[PDB]
Write a protein that binds this ligand. Structure first.
Ligand code: HC1
Ligand code: SF4
Ligand code: SF4
Ligand code: SF4
Ligand code: SF4
Ligand code: FES
Length: 574
């Protein structure tokens, strides 16, 4: 037993944890900034977590272990003067103009400035902001006028992906963060997954904006603007409207999008059922052809970049089905004109994604046919939240509406796509029906669900056993390969997601305060919205989606053949 006194209050504890962890568990206030993902800024620690341990002096609570007989003061004058000084030094390298800033309503640094009444010794007012901003990437942007050099992005990149594509750099004698050799991130091994943005306390890292594309399209009278959101958006945008976590706001998003002036409200979960139509068909074909095995999913652009940059020999093993976003986009410029009379040229398709890598995918040169882009604009969950707020839409009090059904209906298989294992389960529900020409009632594949780094399961399909694997996060893909786990058995189908937890924890998602992250399992609570929708949907197999069956019946023909093979596919050769 340990006896520790914190602010004159006696505590007896069995545990071996840090002063910060103990404080956060016992309602004692200690501020923190550089500590995230169980690591602080080792080199150049922020010291916002300073507490006083009588006898030792000022220590950083985020990495100092509680000890028997320890007497801590978290709020003495010397502690507060030290913390206020460190925030003041950060204010000296921070362009403190919150009014137009994209983190204005949820900035961790603004909260610390208010809390300690910190003031810069000299206001940082850079005249030329172009020497601090890098907007060269199709997915990420850097604004160094806001960077605290707290290292949270560098640690999050290393942990979540193990690429270390985000680095500390010495530009002209001074420390900055950026890509290798200060290149555009797109030209390096970076996966453009945006986990560095998610880890940033301030507006120093952002998504590459597609808001002007959307604004101009809605204002162009001859353009018919389609919008379709990703699985994960309905499970998370409510967080930015003070609704809490795990709230299903699908119906509110549909109404908000109509109020924003979009001409047709569709859903990328329709595109998810399309990807399963093509990919489950392709899996049954590889089974019949005795290979090539394994087949990997090709729907995560972060993973496609990881395969192109680190494992190019695996590219021919990736599924030729386009991702839900791109397969939806292809059909929006071809099928959707045939059932509406719209000129293909006038259809402008916008998606809402939990992801920054999806902007890169949408802008890949060959993701078009006959000069028409599959996808014209991709805005993140955060960008749509700002669009709703700028338009003064009372999101939390909106009435529910439904999507327009032709490319808006989705099955429960499409609904779970945003969670790790979702694509795998959805694909198996169709591939087993397809391969043994039946309609099976047992459709839940709980063995591929959950937050484990690497998951596997043996599935019997048409009286033969097959091995599937789900790789949860880019660092776990590297582990799977480098450890030789890939060679313990013959894998036949492997799902790979670059973000830990799947797309519900994507790089374009709502930022979450580090205090709420320790209290709430964000990956499980966001994913639960999607599994609950599946549980309550009438159709739970992709091939039973009524709107999709008539789309293939009337326009595409059979999946994986003819017109479907001809335009709904994409294969990478580098
Ligand atoms: O971003 C992201 Fe995702 O694996 C999510 O949510 S799940 Fe997807 O196949 C695609 O495209 C689908 O459907 S990638 C998204 O929209
Ligand atoms: S990053 Fe935070 S403190 Fe800095 S200008 Fe933006 S809102 Fe204000
Ligand atoms: S986008 Fe992903 S891979 Fe690139 S620097 Fe950020 S965390 Fe690292
Ligand atoms: S970009 Fe953000 S997370 Fe990275 S060092 Fe700067 S303030 Fe910290
Ligand atoms: S896991 Fe989803 S959010 Fe993350 S990079 Fe892949 S597609 Fe984007
Ligand atoms: S939060 Fe402890 S040194 Fe930064």
């Amino acid at each position: 037993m340990k006896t520790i006194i914190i602010n004159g209050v006696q505590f007896n504890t069995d545990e071996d944890t840090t002063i910060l962890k103990f404080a956060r568990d016992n309602n004692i206030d200690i501020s923190a900034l550089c500590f995230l993902n169980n690591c602080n800024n080792d080199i150049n620690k922020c010291e916002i977590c300073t507490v006083e341990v009588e006898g030792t002096g000022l220590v950083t609570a985020c990495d100092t272990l509680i000890e028997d007989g320890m007497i801590i003061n978290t709020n003495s004058d010397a502690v507060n003067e030290k913390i206020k000084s460190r925030i003041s030094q950060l204010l000296d390298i921070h362009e403190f103009k919150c009014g137009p800033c994209n983190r204005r309503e949820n900035c961790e640094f603004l909260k610390l400035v208010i809390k300690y009444k910190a003031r810069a010794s000299k206001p940082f007012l850079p005249k030329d902001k172009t020497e601090y901003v890098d907007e060269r990437s199709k997915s990420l942007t850097v604004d160094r006028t806001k960077c605290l050099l707290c290292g949270r992005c560098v640690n999050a990149c290393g942990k979540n992906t193990e690429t270390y594509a985000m680095k500390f750099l010495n530009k002209n004698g001074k420390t900055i963060i950026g890509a290798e050799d200060e290149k555009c991130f797109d030209d390096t091994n970076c996966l453009l997954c945006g986990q560095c943005i998610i880890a940033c306390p301030v507006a120093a890292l952002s998504e590459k904006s597609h808001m002007d594309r959307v604004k101009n399209a809605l204002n162009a009278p001859e353009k018919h603007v389609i919008v379709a959101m990703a699985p994960s958006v309905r499970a998370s945008i409510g967080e930015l409207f003070n609704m809490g976590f795990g709230v299903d706001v699908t119906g509110k998003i549909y109404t908000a999008l109509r109020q924003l002036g979009f001409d047709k409200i569709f859903d990328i979960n329709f595109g998810a059922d399309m990807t399963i139509m093509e990919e489950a068909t392709e899996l049954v074909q590889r089974i019949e052809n005795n290979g090539p095995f394994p087949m990997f999913t090709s729907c995560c652009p972060g993973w496609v970049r990881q395969a192109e940059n680190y494992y190019p020999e695996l590219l021919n093993n990736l599924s030729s089905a386009k991702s839900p976003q791109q397969i939806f986009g292809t059909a929006s410029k071809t099928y959707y004109p045939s059932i509406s009379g719209l000129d293909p040229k006038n259809v402008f398709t916008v998606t809402v994604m939990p992801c920054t890598s999806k902007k890169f995918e949408a802008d890949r040169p060959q993701m078009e046919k006959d000069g028409l882009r599959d996808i014209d604009a991709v805005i993140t969950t955060r960008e749509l939240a700002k669009m709703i707020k700028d338009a003064k839409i009372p999101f939390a009090k909106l009435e529910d509406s439904e999507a327009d059904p032709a490319m808006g209906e989705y099955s429960g298989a499409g609904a779970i796509f945003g969670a790790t294992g979702g694509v795998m389960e959805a694909a198996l529900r169709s591939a087993k029906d397809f391969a043994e020409n039946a309609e099976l009632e047992d459709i839940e594949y709980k063995q591929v669900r959950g937050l484990n780094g690497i998951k596997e399961a043996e599935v019997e399909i048409n009286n033969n056993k097959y091995n599937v694997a789900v790789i949860n996060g880019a660092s776990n893909l590297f582990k799977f390969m480098k450890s030789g786990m890939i060679n313990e058995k013959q894998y036949h189908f492997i799902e790979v997601m670059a973000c830990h937890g799947g797309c519900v924890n994507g790089g374009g998602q709502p930022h979450v305060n580090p205090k709420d992250l320790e209290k709430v399992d964000i990956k499980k609570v966001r994913a639960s919205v999607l599994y609950n929708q599946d549980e309550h949907l009438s159709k739970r197999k992709s091939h039973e989606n009524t709107a999709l069956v008539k789309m293939y019946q009337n326009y595409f023909g059979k999946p994986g053949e003819g017109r479907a093979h001809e335009i709904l596919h994409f294969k990478y050769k580098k």
